[PDB]
């Protein structure tokens, strides 16, 4: 994606009803800090999910160690909060060639103060004035009270510890809902056990000229046996004897 927001207004994208391309995640290998939880990253290729939350933002190259489930520091204190029990992966890399610009990057922001620690996964777009001391400022700025938000300072003149990371966080769950997001060569005329689309049986699969209507799946015979099936990957009419 071309434009991640900051951490005070981080973008969240509920994703379901598709398939996971978890291979090139590991084959990317241009990513600085790439960690996971729940069960092993090699294991998560097939072990799949009801409903995932993909939320991303941009933070500093020093504060990214604050991003860890159950730590402290500003980004996890007032900006974006991983829960106490977490499943997903933290994906983190540098985008110094895009974000930090000569003449100064000050598009990005964050919240530096709030009158409590932040509830998990809940953003804070309320840019009203917090009153640290008791003197009421009441919306306008003043004394004992500060502005809530602050920018980052990004230029390519920064060191490597001050480079912008485009941290995308993937979070997962499991429910009464099914695994809506989830990650064998055909043998002709061979007695072969099989499964097509969950349909299971044992037969001799052949080429067959009986002609389906497109939406259809099975064929059947007089006896309510499963007579003929269509190969889902390459549409073809396959008998079952």
């Amino acid at each position: 994606a071309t434009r991640f927001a900051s951490v005070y207004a981080w973008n969240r994208k509920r994703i379901s009803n598709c398939v996971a391309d978890y291979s090139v995640l590991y084959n990317s290998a241009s990513f600085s800090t790439f960690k996971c939880y729940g069960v092993s990253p090699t294991k998560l290729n097939d072990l799949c999910f009801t409903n995932v939350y993909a939320d991303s933002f941009v933070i500093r190259g020093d504060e990214v160690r604050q991003i860890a489930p159950g730590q402290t520091g500003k980004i996890a204190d007032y900006n974006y909060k991983l829960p106490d029990d977490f499943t997903g992966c933290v994906i983190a890399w540098n985008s110094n060639n895009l974000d930090s610009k000569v003449g100064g990057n000050y598009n990005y922001l964050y919240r530096l103060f709030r009158k409590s620690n932040l509830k998990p996964f809940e953003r804070d777009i309320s840019t009203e004035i917090y009153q640290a001391g008791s003197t009421p400022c009441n919306g306008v700025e003043g004394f004992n009270c500060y502005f809530p938000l602050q920018s980052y300072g990004f230029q390519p003149t920064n060191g490597v510890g001050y480079q912008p990371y485009r941290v995308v966080v993937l979070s997962f769950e499991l429910l009464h809902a099914p695994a809506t997001v989830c990650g064998t060569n055909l043998v002709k005329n061979k007695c072969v056990n099989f499964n097509f689309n969950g349909l299971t049986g044992t037969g001799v699969l052949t080429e067959s000229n009986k002609k389906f209507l497109p939406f259809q799946q099975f064929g059947r015979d007089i006896a309510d046996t499963t007579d003929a099936v269509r190969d889902p990957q390459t549409l073809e009419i396959l008998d079952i004897t």
Partner: antibody
Amino acid sequence: QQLVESGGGVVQPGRSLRLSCAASGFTFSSYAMHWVRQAPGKGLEWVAVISYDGSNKYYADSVKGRFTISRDNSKNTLYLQMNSLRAEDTAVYYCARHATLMNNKDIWGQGTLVTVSS
Amino acid sequence: GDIQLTQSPSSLSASVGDRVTITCRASQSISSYLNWYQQKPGKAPKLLIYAASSLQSGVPSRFSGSGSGTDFTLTISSLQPEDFATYYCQQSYSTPRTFGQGTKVEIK
């Protein structure tokens, strides 16, 4: 990034003249905004605030003329109607912002002349 | 009542390469909430120092702020031929905000 102002002009005293100032580059919405006054040869005198992040309006009691201030946030614009005029207010106005130890957002309009004279 | 400012001196006709200390004094004890502005007459007031002790983008350390409480200091150093203009201090402590009367640094 940029602030534009409504047109100044010569207005008879006792009248009213709504002041429009639209933003560009970043929104009015997340910030406050101010008005200040510069008479020719005189110092910059603060006039009034706006505070969109709740809602509150503060005026200078030095020039306490009920110069009313409110918003058009969705156009990133701000409206202060010149009420209860008097000739010494004949000056240039600016749309303003104060770096309150946190930000560096002090952005200033181009300046337009309000004139109070018959 | 209001908070009075005291900007001293209200003008100082200066020369090349000086180190001018434009003082802004305060009637109350203000923590650091004071600023500084560049104004050539007819321009927009370009902010110079925020919170009385911090520099600004585009403005090098030829300007340098310090002070707290009542006493605030504009530390102009190695005075440049473009720096001769009308300048201003600024409270943001309470409401109302007032600004200083201005100090015009100008070529001798």
